[PDB]
Every structure is written in C-alpha cells, then in structure tokens.
A paper describes a structure:
The CP folds into three jelly-roll β sandwiches. The B and C domains clustered at the 3-fold axis. The structural variability of CP subunits within a capsid was very low.
differs from its parent strain (GFLV-F13) by a single Gly297Asp mutation. position 297 is replaced by Asp. deficiency of GFLV-TD by X. index. transmission was correlated with a lack of virus retention by X. index, although virus acquisition by nematodes was not affected. solvation shell via the addition of 60 negative charges in GFLV-TD. with respect to that of wild-type GFLV-F13. feeding apparatus, thereby reducing its transmissibility. ligand-binding pocket was correlated to a defect in virus transmission.
Residue numbers in the entry:
A (entry chain T), D (entry chain E): 1 to 168
B (entry chain A): 1 to 504
C (entry chain E): 337 to 504
Write the structure that this text describes.
Amino acid sequence: GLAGRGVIYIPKDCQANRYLGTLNIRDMISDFKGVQYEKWITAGLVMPTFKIVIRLPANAFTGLTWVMSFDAYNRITSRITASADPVYTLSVPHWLIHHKLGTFSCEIDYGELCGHAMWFKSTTFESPRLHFTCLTGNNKELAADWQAVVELYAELEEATSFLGKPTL
Amino acid sequence: GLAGRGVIYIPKDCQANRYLGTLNIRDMISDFKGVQYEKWITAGLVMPTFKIVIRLPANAFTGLTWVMSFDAYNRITSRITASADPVYTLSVPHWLIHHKLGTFSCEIDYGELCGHAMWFKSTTFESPRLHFTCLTGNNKELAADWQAVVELYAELEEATSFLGKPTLVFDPGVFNGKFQFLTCPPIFFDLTAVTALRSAGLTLGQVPMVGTTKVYNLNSTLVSCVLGMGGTVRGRVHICAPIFYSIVLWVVSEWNGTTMDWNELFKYPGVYVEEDGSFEVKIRSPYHRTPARLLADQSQRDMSSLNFYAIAGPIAPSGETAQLPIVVQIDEIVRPDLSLPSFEDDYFVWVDFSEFTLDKEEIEIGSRFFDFTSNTCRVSMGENPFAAMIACHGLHSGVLDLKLQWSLNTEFGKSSGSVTITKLVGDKAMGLDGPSHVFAIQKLEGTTELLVGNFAGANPNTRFSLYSRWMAIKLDQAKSIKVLRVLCKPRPGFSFYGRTSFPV
Amino acid sequence: DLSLPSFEDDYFVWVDFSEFTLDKEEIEIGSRFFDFTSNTCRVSMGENPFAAMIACHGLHSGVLDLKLQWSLNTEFGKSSGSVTITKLVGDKAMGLDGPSHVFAIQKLEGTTELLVGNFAGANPNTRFSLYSRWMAIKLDQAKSIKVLRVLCKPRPGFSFYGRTSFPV
Amino acid sequence: GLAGRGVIYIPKDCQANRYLGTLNIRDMISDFKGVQYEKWITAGLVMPTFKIVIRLPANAFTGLTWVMSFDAYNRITSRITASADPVYTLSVPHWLIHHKLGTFSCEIDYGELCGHAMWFKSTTFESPRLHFTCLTGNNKELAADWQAVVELYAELEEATSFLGKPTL
C-alpha cells in the first residue's frame, strides 16, 4: 500500500536542465508515518521492492521530458542543485518521464539498485535520494506554476540479511 | 425516418450558461410536414420513440459542453431565456453534449419521459420543448458564429391509449438507490492555483436553489423519502476542456470539513481521476450514513461530502485563461446502507384551514390535489414528499383517502352546524349526487375518499377542465372552528407520469 | 421458581402533565424518550423497567405506540380547543409534514406512534442532534385540562445497546 | 497485534476504594500510533474485538484485588475520581483482577459491550474509558510505589455498519 509521498514543484517556464527537487526516500515514509512506516519500526531492517508512481497530468503540447534519478548513495546531489547536467542525472539508475504519457510508474528493487537494507532509526551509509530534473524543456512556458506528486508503494517486511545479492 | 428538424445558432463566444434556443418538438414535425407528420394526422394520437440527433462538428480544441433539456411540460422555459443556470437545465431529463465527441444521438421514449400521447391538431396540456444551453464555455472565442442541426427520427404509429406507463408509483417504503438524470452543476479549477479543493455536498435531499428560487426536482424528492444513506457513490466524471488542458484529481469522501494534513488525506480511501471515466467512493461518516436533509443552521459541508482535490494541475499552454471544469454525474448508491424511510404508509398533512372570517365558507376541491387560496380564511399548505412528487411530474392519477379533523373556537355546548362534504359527478351546476356526507360539527372528525383524476385518466399539475367526480367542503359555522385539518393517504397504485421539475 | 412478570405486554405511564399556567403550551418530544421539564406546568415522570432500561444502556432504538388521555378542569359545555400532535420529518423550522393530528379537546383521548431513533439508527440517553422524525404535543387551551397522561407501549423489537449504569 | 497501551500508578498503600486512574481507549491507540491506529484511519469505522492485558507482578502476600470497569459511555467517571465506591465500579461491565493471579487478560467484544462503531477522527457520543480501582486493599502497605501496564491487542478491520447487535 501507499508507504510514503512527496511533492515536486514545476515552474511555469521549465527549461532543460532545471533542478526541480530532491525527495529523501526515508523521509517520505517517516513524514507519512504511515502503516508501512510503523511496520518498519517493528522489522528494524527492510529490503523493499518499491513501486514508484509520479502523478502528473498527461499533456502532448509541451515537449517536457523529466528524469528521475535514484541516488541511493548521494553521489550526484551536490553537483545538480544549481543546474542539473544530464551527464550527472543519467549516470545513476534513472527513468525518463515523458509528459505526453502522463502518470508514470516503475519498480525499484532495493535489493538490486541499492544493495543494503534500511534501518528504521537512522541512515546507515548515506541517505537514499530521488532527484527530479528536466531533461528537455517546454517549447514555450506554460500558463502557470504547477506540481507533481511522487508516491511510494510497498509491502514492507522484515529483512533477513543486511546485504542484497551483488549487482556485479 | 426523418420526422422533423431545426437549427440552433451558436455564437462565436459561447460562454457558460448561454441560452442558445428552444425547439418546439411538435413544430419541428409540422414545419417539416413531412411523411411522418402526415401519418400523424391520420393516426390522431402518437406515442413516439424518437431518436434525436444533433449534428455538430467534432472538435477537441474548444472545451465546449452543451446540455439538451427535454421539457415536455414547459416548466423551465420562462426561467432560462435570459441566462440558463445549470440548476434549471439539469432539473429535467437531459443529456450532455461534448464538443470533442461531435455528432450526438439519444433515444427519447415519449411514453416514459412524457406520459401522454400527442394530438396532431393542437397541444393538449403544454407544448413539449427541447432546450439547448451551454454548460461549460469555450476556452477562447471561436473564429466565427456557427450553427448545429437538430433532427428527430421516428416511425410514428397510432397510439392505442392516451396514457403511457407510469414513471413512478407512490410508495414511502421504497427508494432503491439508483438515480437517473442526477447531474451536478460544473465544478471549476483555476490554473493559477498549484493545488485546490472543490467540495460537492452529498445531502441529496436538499432542494437546489437559484437565487431565492427553489427548484423542486424528482431526485431530491426521492432522497427525502429516506432519513439518510450510506454506502458507495457510483458516478462518472467528465473533464470538460480542450485536449491541451489536463489535470489529476484525488477524489475522496470526508465528514464535517476537511483535514489540513496532506498525509492524512492520502490515508483515506479515495480514487485518482486523470480523464473521463467512472468512479466509486465510499460515503465517509462517523455514523456510516449522511442525513438526507439539513436542519436549521446546518451546512452541507457539516456532513458527508464528495471532495475533489486537484493534486497535479490543471495545466495548459500559455496564455490560456479559462478554468478547467469537471462535470459530475451520480448514477447510484451501490451496496447501500439506508436509514429508515422518512415516512410510513400513513396519512400526512395536505392542508390546514384556520382564522375563518365568515360563517359560510365553501372550499372547492373538484378532482385535484393542489395548493389552496382564500381571501376569507388562512390556508397553510403541507410540504412533504408526496406533494413534491405531484409537483415534479407532468401528470398524476390515483385515489386519496382523506381524514378531516377539527377543534372548536366557541364553547362546545353552544356549537351547531356541520362540516359537509359535497360529492358530485360533473360540477356544481349540473352534477349528479354521489356519497355526500354531513358531519355534525360535534363529531369533530370525518373521513372521505377523493378521486384525483378524470375521464381522460390523469391530471396535469395545473388548472384544467375535464369531466370527473367533484368534491367540496362546506362550512356553515366556520367561525366556530379553530382549525380544520385535512390529511390524505394515497391508495396503492397512485401513479405519476413524466418526470420534470417545479420552480417557485 | 419465578413469579408472574411484574408487567404485561401493555402500556405503562411515560409522563403526566398537569397544573397548566398558560393556555398555550407546547411540549417538544422530537425523536427521544426522556425526562421532560417545564417552567409553565407540572411534569410527573413515570418510573418503570422500560425507563430504567433506557437509562441503563448507551444506545436504544425502536417504536413506541402512544396513548394520550385527559380530563377537563372547566365545564364540559364550555370547552374548546385541542390536543394537537405535530409530526414532522426534520425540525420545526424546515421540516416536512407527516401524520399530524388534531384531537378536539372533547375527544378526551387520542393515539399516535413515536419513532425513537434517527438516521444513524439509535439514540444515546442524552440530548443529541441527528436528523429524524419529530414530534410535539400542542395545547391551545391547556388551562382547561386537569391532567394530560401519556402512556407508551414499545413495539416488538425495541432494542438496547451497551449495558451500563445511571447514577442520580 | 498491540494496538495501544497505557500505565496505571499504584500507591504503596493501596487501600479499599482508591481510584487509581482512567485510561481513555481511543487515546491509548492514538498516542501509540500504531500499525493498528493507522489501519483505523483508513477504515474510518472499527468495531474491534479487543484483548485487554494488564501486566502486573503476581503476588500472594498482599490480598490486593482491583476492578477494571469498562465505561463506554462515561457514566461513572465523575463520581469515582475522589473515591471509588464499589457500587459504581461494579455497575458497568467489569472484571476482577486478583493480585495472586498476576497478569490478567479478558476479551471485550466492542460490538456487544459498546454497540456503536468508533470513528478515527473524534468521539461520536461519549469517549470510552477503562477505570482502574481498588476493590480490596493490601493487608499492610507495600515496600514502595509501583505501576501496572495496560495493553490493547486487536486486528482492526473496517466496520460494515454503525450499529452492533442489540445486547437486549
């Protein structure tokens, strides 16, 4: 079920390479707080399979494409908050979000994309982030500022091991 | 085949609530004149099944939505010709016409929606109209004025009876939970807002208003037959805007205001709406039901509401300015949790007469159930579902059992005279004498039956002159009476024809 | 080894009104079975198992058949007016008209039914505001009445919820 | 699972008729907050079957007996907060807790003992309380003040009706 949520603010003039924001995955779940958050406290460690949903009004008249970057180890954050070069945002696991397709969804198997289980009380190594950036801009500015909603769905259960299976 | 036709003229700037025009159904057929019109003359009476087609260039770049209102009894015409409030246009059988879908078509079974057969030579009760109004306006004006074509298709054959089959038969203990023609007026979202809330009340028995005018309609009347309801609202949402506008809605039910915490919001059981489609939302309440009507000083938001949260959008290209309209239709309460019926199979007040100024008072009833007036005494009319059902149909027919009760103004020992019920067939001047009854005033109560109907088989909700039984109440010592109360209880099978509305 | 039941399936006293000081007296019942008060007449409440059962539950619901009886204070030949039962759905201000009933005072008795309940389905043993049927007894010549007695007899299925107690 | 909890404070000299405290059932669940509390928010209405557990060191050398009174309609609260007469505490559904038996447990079928379903956001009629009182005192005072833990276990699921089945 819904485990956490957050909001990304889109300026009326969303140009290529605009940083839109960063959501902190653990904060989304703890600020929500949360049937899943509460199951997590009891489990201690979780290795979730998240379904991420970005709710987003479909529109074919803008040309907007965004990138969601999964930055589990906080490697690109510092370098994209002023301006997000696609070389950075595309250098970690990521998904293209096309405006024409509207509401977007993907699976993040935290076991694979991340590798280590999450501890209810505090971050272990670094804090896992989702970055939202604009890859291709709108053909002309839109009528007004707007927002998109980011949602995390999961059925959190107790993790049996600290470590995932090796990506490589 | 084609039986009649007409034209609706659309202004280049078609704004919400613009009245576009009224077509008179019988005139469409007679001005055409017409293989069908000619078959009609021979038949005398017809109970058509019409296919109505509105020819209309499909266009996804305007956001225009129109309403065609079937007004068989001419109930809303006078009130929409300057400006058409959706409360009126949606209060009778109606159809949404979306510009993106282009040419529109529907069936009107005149037997059901109307109730009485049409006479080739002249209108019988009132003249059946089709109204065309704009429900949601164009995002920006179009290039030029234009027109749409309305067409009637039918294979007219001779009608065997004057009366259709009754749309509704009076029963207090029966409100199913399925609705027809329950459309909420448009809800609007500004694009200058990053998020927003629009509430729709679920106190469905509440009578809708336009300024100071009450618009009685069948749906609110039906709901008033119940104390309250819970369950799941099944409906449809229509997003009435150009392809280049879009929005994402979180639709959920809340009780007594709304939470201010976005996180709580999404812990409730709602549904997401991105585009035209159906929806099911559980009615949310501490009592699991929301009341059918409001008491004094209460607001519809104090109870259960259907809330529409804009969580992403609406968005549009620059420089659009129009709001994004959402039109909600409610089809039924599924898996309903109903309260008790508000009324039992029992009597209810029709009218109280009091404050008599003359000893001789004679109240003509005839064969009608209706609102009385008097210059010589005070009339207090009862308000209840039955009376509204009468007001919300074109025709009705049945039998009322009456109970009369009265109390004295003067000392009992000094009392004399009677409450006399005159029962004739015909009229006062040439009528035959039926079961007239003299109740000596000391009885202080009496009973009688009233036929609501006539030789044709049904009454309109207006004055009319059709041979029937005829009743009157005669008082000879009225100043001795403090109050005369008349209650009625419809006999099984009391019938209504042609759902419509009644503005006052 | 039980005795006879103390009560039969019969009416019992709910309330006696007497010693009326004003000709106009209007007693609001609404949808409740409860203890009346008045500044303008004397109220004498009945005490019996039914009333205690109402007092010893959190919620109750059902239908009461009512019998009203009265006797005159003034000479019969001089009497006028009525005991009127107002029956609405809603409230006095915006209510729909039900089976209201005008009992000429010379009838000296009348009957009616009272729904004890509301749209939610049950009443607490306190004041509350929940849409329901609504009843009142209207007197226009109360000073002519020596006593107005209201008896009630619960229809089968009168229900109680949540056993509790009631200190006074 | 555990749905809420609270604490009762026992004085070293626990005499007959000492009022020990009142736990508010809905507060226990909302202060805990709570996998069950969060399921409740989603359900709106719950008709729980609670298992109540009072954790309590078994002791055969005191003679202490307490009463837990289920006061769903807040009928005795006002009259027991200074001193709790057993006539009040035993006048609503209640359980005897004997010190010799230690940790105590019972079931409260909220459908029966209460009658109406609970609304996540606020109290409907009155707020359901558990009262803790001393029925028989300690033979002599104990060594020091102490405490007992009260716990609510339930698997909250959505209530289909407002009303239970009638107790009577």
